[PDB]
Homo-oligomer: A and B are copies of this chain.
Amino acid sequence: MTKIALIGSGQIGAIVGELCLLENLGDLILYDVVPGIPQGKALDLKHFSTILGVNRNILGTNQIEDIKDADIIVITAGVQRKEGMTREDLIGVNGKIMKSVAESVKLHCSKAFVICVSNPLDIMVNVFHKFSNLPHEKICGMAGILDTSRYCSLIADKLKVSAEDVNAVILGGHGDLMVPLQRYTSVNGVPLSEFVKKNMISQNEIQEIIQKTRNMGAEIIKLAKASAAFAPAAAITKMIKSYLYNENNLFTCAVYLNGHYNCSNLFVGSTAKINNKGAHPVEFPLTKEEQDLYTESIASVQSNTQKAFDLIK
């Protein structure tokens, strides 16, 4: 009975649709502006569903009114960045697209939980909120899970351990001003600081890792000649699962802050719980230095978000 609408049928959308089918999360509505594309991918995905014994319904459409009564909405519509570009260079073109999608969600399915993915992520979540007229807990953006996966994955490699239970918190915008928190990094419960004391990893090796995390998006663009698609889709699916199954899992994602971390009236990457009712920030006790860094990230997101609103006229 659950309806999942993918607004954007590119790489990410399609793989998200694939991963939702694998876990039987819901019926799919594949939407795109470009004619034929969603219908073709929907055909493929049906055949895929037949081979693997999944039976959910899949509809490829160019009519956005087909999004009606979606329980979940995943927004990948928009242009992606190429080599040499920043995510912020897309601000003009994608802000306009995001507003249009917001307006459509507003009139067709105001009760949906909305995961925004268009870049620059945090900024575009703010645009979607402004024009959508949905409650703020029902809107979020995925980024922190992806940055966290990269950071953890690199930490796990250096420590010669499974990435499976390396966890971490990364605060702030999906960009160069991420704030990975060493204090909030653990390996199956054991803080990262124990591994530095045991000389299994150094402060410098960690700073190196943090740098690779920051530039990872660009690095994959450079190497693959396309932007990352699999990891973003898995992260999105993780957030969908947390909502549908009322899991109350604690992630980092772009979320409405409201007096948390000295910030109010802005969507930005932060620690949050996702359940039945949406995405809910949680504040943890930061040091002065940690909070200073986080505020600095929050200042960029503030500026750029204003810029985005300005450029939309």
Contacts and interface: CB of A to CB of B under 8 A. Distances in A.
Interface of A: 1, 14-15, 18, 22-24, 36-37, 39-41, 43-53, 55-57, 60, 110, 129-130, 132-138, 145-146, 149-150, 152-153, 156, 160-169, 181, 183-191, 194, 197-198, 216, 219-226, 228-231, 233-235, 238, 241-242, 245-251, 258-259, 262-265, 271, 273, 276, 283-285
A224 to B, nearest CB: 3
Given A51-B231, A136-B264, 4 more contacts: A15-B18, A51-B234, A57-B246, A169-B188
Contact of A165 (B15, B130, B249): B249
A161 B55 CA distance: 10
16 contacts: A23-B24, A36-B223, A44-B228, A44-B230, A44-B231, A47-B150, A47-B153, A110-B259, A133-B259, A136-B258, A162-B248, A165-B250, A167-B167, A181-B189, A183-B191, A188-B249
Contacts of A251: 188
A49 B223 contact: no
A153 B44 contact: no
B51 A53 contact: no
Contacts of A283: 198
Contact of A132 (B50, B137, B247, B264): B264
A308 to B, nearest CB: 16
Nearest to A24: B245
B50 A149 contact: yes
Contact of A191 (B186, B230, B238): B186
Given A136-B258, A262-B133, A146 B223 contact: no
A220 B164 contact: no
A18, A188, A235 interface centre (most CB from chain B within 10 Å):
A188
Contacts of A153: 46-47, 49-50
Contacts of A245: 24, 55-56
A10 to B, nearest CB: 11
User: What 5 pairs between A and B have smallest CB-CB spacing?
Assistant: A40-B224, A40-B223, A47-B231, A167-B189, A135-B259
A55 B250 contact: no
A48, A110, A130 interface centre (most CB from chain B within 10 Å):
A48
A263 B226 CA distance: 39
B48 A234 contact: yes
A244 to B, nearest CB: 8
